[PDB]
Design a protein around this ligand. Structure first.
Ligand SMILES: Cc1ncc(Cn2c(C)c(CCOP(=O)(O)OP(=O)(O)O)sc2=O)c(N)n1
Ligand SMILES: Cc1ncc(Cn2c(C)c(CCOP(=O)(O)OP(=O)(O)O)sc2=O)c(N)n1
Ligand SMILES: Cc1ncc(Cn2c(C)c(CCOP(=O)(O)OP(=O)(O)O)sc2=O)c(N)n1
Ligand SMILES: [Ca+2]
Ligand SMILES: [Ca+2]
Ligand SMILES: [Ca+2]
Ligand SMILES: [Mg+2]
Ligand SMILES: [Mg+2]
Ligand SMILES: [Mg+2]
Ligand SMILES: [Mg+2]
Ligand SMILES: [Mg+2]
Ligand SMILES: [Mg+2]
Ligand SMILES: [Mg+2]
Lengths: 525, 525, 525
């Protein structure tokens, strides 16, 4: 067998059947004789390729395979990799290298010092020392991406390797099963359970690895047993809990002082599947107030190491959540009372308040909708206004890198064909990965894109205000016609200048057979 | 003085007055109180920011200053940095970092292991250990980018540094002059000159560092004195010689065997300002044929080290070209005869042959036009069909990374307001950095964009053919409306479905007061 | 509190009370006011510092703290770090950096790009962005070194940081408990146990992480229950099993073909706490023969990923070994029969055969002796001839880097004051870290050093023979007087030119009150 044949067999035996890519000459010898059981999803720029694959991986809860062109293609994708690192997305990034005979002279398209290029944003990065090593290196890539804590990996392959003879002993790679589905030993788990059972006023904080593990239902059981309020850890990339469950208390503010104040009076705070904590704004104060102890369960040693407070347990989130939910006592305390519904913001017959948009989406979207957020000034209101009952219902750029949601929404929709995906994206954010629209059109992936158009980088204007920073350039983005951009890439386009038009456009979009972009005129800050 | 004030003073004293950027929160404390003598050029995605700055730097022959957002912004720009590395573009890339107090906990927007992120695509990469060090670090960045061999550099700055007190001793940085304008010592230069004078059949090969140095006119004098044919080194990122000068022999094929065959019979081959050589296709054979010796003058030790043949001299291209041109004897050999004009390709009343497009551009464009190429299957014909008399008349992505020409054409046009810039870009290539169009519209930079629309990644289809590679996915890009994309970003749009319409559209574009995009229907391969 | 005070409090609260070091100016502000409850162990060169700390950490099964001088000191230790990486040794390596004000100018003693220096041999490498971050960074270092898979970490600290005010919120670091004591979930563990119970002819292979975890006794129980032969994985850095237990089958040959042949006929092979496998010699063949399946339990994702065959489980070795030993059925198969005693090699009244030396050590050493091996041509015989009943009884350089055993033997002896440490070191190997002898003398650490003097790099001569490699230089090391070297560093020295003298010297050494070096005249290969 050839390295080509052996590698595709390894991929299929390990459950991979889709290649997300933008092709180049170094990759043609890999892509030739493309297997009939695989599918190739083309995107027009590499940030889009990786964003689509990322959404697909996160929603499918399995690794996604990417093929990029040498250094330039890899480089174009590095902002996308920054998000993938923070979301623990299992991405296998392969890039084609020049033929071994032309690497030394640094021919055009040579990826120089290739393994260093994507660092520090990958778990593992490698170029094999010979063609026959390629399948083994691919095996390593698959498992490194997939083991807890999951994350992106990078493999560079000289294009002449594919046609070479494979090592017959590579067959031992095909069916390897590698598990990191582990939890705390019985003795220490019993100690943890007793601490939870004995708490007088416990609180629970959940992060994105709960949703990645599909541990959501177990966390609901845990919260109900402990009669504990549940918060989502700050800067949330996913939604780990039903947002109308009585225990739910919403998104934590991303500040040190704000969080310790929120947790004051809670004697034991159990954090599951989150960094402690992904703070954002400068908000100095106490990490915890006296009387509060924190216990963190994380899948990531790097998270456990850097927490400024609390104990930590490094283990699989799915296994730990299931064990805790089934071991803790049913507290006799009263179940927390559900948060009240948000207020209806006054809305005239003109430009839309973001609150109106979210209320209307919540009214009209199916109960199993999936939302993506890249409307940076409206996140708090989005979290308060969308009832998300099911797992896998929310995604937001985990490293704060814009250009995620538009392509990721396409990948999520590909992963979940029966769940309507609705991406709510600011006019500023929409541009970073605008060409991803073409992939939705070409493959008829019926994502709905809602563009919140207020003509400005609103979150930055707001921050400039808090800094009292005057004379900051580059904050306004006037003069973009999103319906024309959608037309450019073959996506049906609608406009909504007021509430009547928003409802009409959403009704049309929800009944459409393909992707739809709605440009919404929103109020300026 | 503050670090902010001192740093802007350093920048202005070192000749920097423009910031190319896409802003973020970590950069707001740098951008606040933006000096009234500086200008800020916003682009909507970071590949576009860096591409614009790159074109500006290359055309202006001076460093360009860039400001990006943390890791995600830097990452989005890394494909652009790959081109900049290969073109020796003097780019100062700054990125904002989290406040020092929040780096340890890895707050959102922390650029982790920041200096490693852009490696290996930068000459120098650094984060200062204290606020007061920032001006000195910026000084280092300026000089590292600017010294031969020029290239991109990276500086990460915690956002809280800007408001801190500067070291008064930083004033010594302001007026530092650093020179690498050096040439071979007299004794060894005399030896080189004698070898050139004694050659029976010399040839000259020129690369992009000749154009960067504005050594073009000196190379013309050198070629005339030696009565030598002149080739442009393969994979050419710039044009270093007047293309209708009698000595000009065109672009070298990017193959080992092809080049040694071309050089056969030439006893001394002098290469100036190029790698030896930027080969591309697999074309094995002899590096040089018996009877040919090669001497390379390069500004880059890395180039001198990796040449598989020949002697090398590492020195400034401007200084060396001037010295050689003025020292060599006037040979009594006959001056080479000019290459004949290219053939006129048969053209019916339908879709345009690329040859027709280039002939028409050559007919209608001003004699001081500047062209950018990102029409990958048509490069050879472009080189044969455009009369480029002046320096700085051609740019092509130096690392082969698409997404360069569209934004770079805007930067070049900003650098050269009196020279009409015409970017000839394939339909595939146009998408990588499509949002750059907005910057041309917003700042009214009157670049003309000619989109060669043949519906496919033509160069890849061609290569698949030579590989006899069947069943390669992802080679077709149907269904893009470039006039709608132009409308989306505020750029006047025209179509040309035939020659009559092409001439009409070019006439309109050449007389327009702003940027114009022409979508040309070209023949499919 | 100062950063100095806070950092020492953190160290003591996390169980650290010893600093292994070689001091320099950048470290004096850390070492001043050295706490009276800490001890400082000086060694004369940094390879020795790290080797001593490594032995101490491995034997104590807890992290060891190291303090080195800037780049040169760190660099001198990097061979030692290569061993520490392979042995999963929890080492906290700190190095002093120049004062922040002098880093920019690259004053003498500046550690440039410090965090990159020890890569790729550390789990985590870092320089803090401010003085107040130092305690948090130290906390991260402690936990990163200590979490599974354990390993070395690196922290660079500007010397001016120590006197600065600490953040009062650093107190939350002091008592953090971080656990990776995890095992496979119940459902999947039950599946594993059933596979073991159902095996017709199981085999067990154990690696160094078993001894590190003190899982030895649990593995004995497991082997007895399964009635399974037990091998030590190749290139063994530690001894994980009693070497005279009836199940013990010795050290596996470090070859692919040799191992698959050894395992032929075994239907299930359970590997615990080893890479699969640390092969060494070129010995191509099948990874496993038909009929053999392999299951690996490893603490290291990197090991699980790179195994060329078998299933893997990534978990804590102590927790897994205990669970398996207590869950498996008692097989009704016959317990394996003990290996026969090794043959007595003929020995005349002249130079010593290595076999004679090991037999004599086994005869005379206490039953709880600890051996270190750096006698590279005699390893197989050592493994056959020493009865090691207890855990922590054997160490060998895990990355094959010589210079480990001499200093490590001092660290082990410091960790285990009631167990006589005997280091058996070749004349070649003895030189790499010879100055470590001084530390044993100065602190009166009563290690016994047995120098096997055959005048040559015997293992290399042997390998040259198998390569049929003629005319290899540099294989002989005549003219070293080890008794004089011992005298040089203050260690009692004895010679043994024959068996009578060996017995006499060992008797004297075993009764001595301080360290002793015995130079043994061994047979030449
Ligand atoms: C790749 C990248 N570049 C720049 C930024 C910085 N950025 C700016 C550019 C965002 C403003 C987004 O504007 P929007 O129109 O999408 O939404 P709002 O008007 O609601 O803020 S928020 C802020 O994080 C970023 N996060 N990512
Ligand atoms: C960033 C990036 N991605 C992928 C490629 C590989 N690429 C492909 C995508 C190009 C085809 C360009 O298509 P085009 O429409 O712009 O021009 P032609 O049809 O004349 O080839 S040429 C080839 O180098 C690349 N060079 N750079
Ligand atoms: C730091 C280092 N340098 C060189 C070597 C290579 N080396 C050579 C130098 C060793 C020979 C050791 O000689 P010895 O006297 O200690 O023992 P033998 O005579 O029994 O081989 S074995 C072999 O691995 C090494 N392992 N480590
Ligand atoms: Ca906006
Ligand atoms: Ca095309
Ligand atoms: Ca020896
Ligand atoms: Mg990098
Ligand atoms: Mg247990
Ligand atoms: Mg699916
Ligand atoms: Mg001179
Ligand atoms: Mg100008
Ligand atoms: Mg369980
Ligand atoms: Mg002890």
């Amino acid at each position: 067998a050839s390295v080509h044949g052996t590698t595709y067999e390894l991929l299929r035996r390990q459950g991979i059947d889709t290649v997300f890519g933008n092709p180049g000459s170094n990759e043609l010898p890999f892509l030739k004789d493309f297997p009939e059981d695989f599918r190739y999803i083309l995107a027009l720029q590499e940030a889009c390729v990786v964003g689509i694959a990322d959404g697909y991986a996160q929603a499918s809860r399995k690794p996604a395979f990417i093929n990029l062109f040498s250094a330039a293609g890899t480089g174009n994708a590095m902002g996308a990799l920054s998000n993938a690192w923070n979301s623990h997305s299992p991405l296998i990034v392969t890039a084609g290298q020049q033929t071994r005979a032309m690497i030394g002279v640094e021919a055009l398209l040579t990826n120089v010092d290739a393994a260093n290029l994507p660092r520090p944003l990958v778990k593992w990065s490698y170029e094999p020392a010979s063609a026959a090593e390629v399948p083994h290196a691919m095996s390593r890539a698959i498992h490194m991406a997939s083991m807890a804590p999951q994350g992106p990996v990078y493999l560079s392959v000289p294009y002449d390797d594919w046609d070479k003879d494979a090592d017959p002993q590579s067959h031992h790679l095909f069916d390897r099963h590698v598990s990191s589905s582990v939890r705390l030993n019985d003795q220490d788990l019993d100690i943890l359970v007793k601490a939870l059972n004995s708490a007088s006023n416990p609180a629970i904080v959940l992060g994105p690895d709960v949703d990645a593990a599909n541990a959501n239902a177990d966390c609901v059981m845990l919260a109900e047993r402990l009669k504990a309020p549940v918060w989502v850890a700050p800067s949330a990339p996913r939604c780990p809990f039903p947002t109308r469950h009585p225990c739910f208390r919403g998104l934590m503010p991303a500040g040190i002082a704000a969080i310790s104040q929120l947790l004051e009076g809670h004697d034991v705070v159990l954090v599951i599947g989150a960094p402690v904590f992904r703070y954002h704004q400068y908000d100095p104060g106490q990490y915890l107030k006296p009387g509060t102890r924190l216990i963190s369960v994380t899948c990531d040693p790097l998270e456990a190491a850097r927490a400024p407070m609390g104990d930590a347990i490094v283990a699989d989130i799915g296994a730990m959540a299931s064990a805790l939910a089934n071991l803790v006592e049913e507290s006799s305390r009263q179940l927390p009372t559900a948060a009240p519904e948000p207020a209806k913001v006054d809305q005239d017959a003109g430009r839309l308040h973001p609150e109106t948009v979210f209320d209307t989406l919540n009214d009209m979207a199916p109960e199993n909708a999936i939302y993506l957020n890249e409307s940076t000034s409206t996140t708090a209101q989005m979290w308060q206004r969308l009832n998300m009952r099911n797992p896998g219902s929310y995604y937001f750029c985990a490293a704060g890198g814009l250009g995620f949601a538009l392509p990721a929404a396409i990948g999520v929709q590909l992963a979940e064909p029966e769940r309507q995906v609705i991406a709510v994206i600011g006019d500023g954010s929409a541009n970073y990965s605008i060409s991803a629209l073409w992939t939705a059109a070409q493959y008829n992936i019926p994502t709905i894109f809602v563009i919140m158009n207020n003509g400005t980088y609103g979150a930055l204007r707001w921050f400039a205000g808090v800094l009292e920073a005057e004379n900051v350039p580059g904050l306004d983005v006037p003069g973009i016609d999103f319906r024309a951009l959608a037309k450019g890439y073959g996506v049906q386009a609608l406009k909504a200048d007021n509430l009547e038009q928003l409802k009409g456009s959403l009704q049309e979009a929800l009944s459409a057979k393909g992707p739809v972009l709605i440009e919404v005129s929103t109020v300026s800050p």
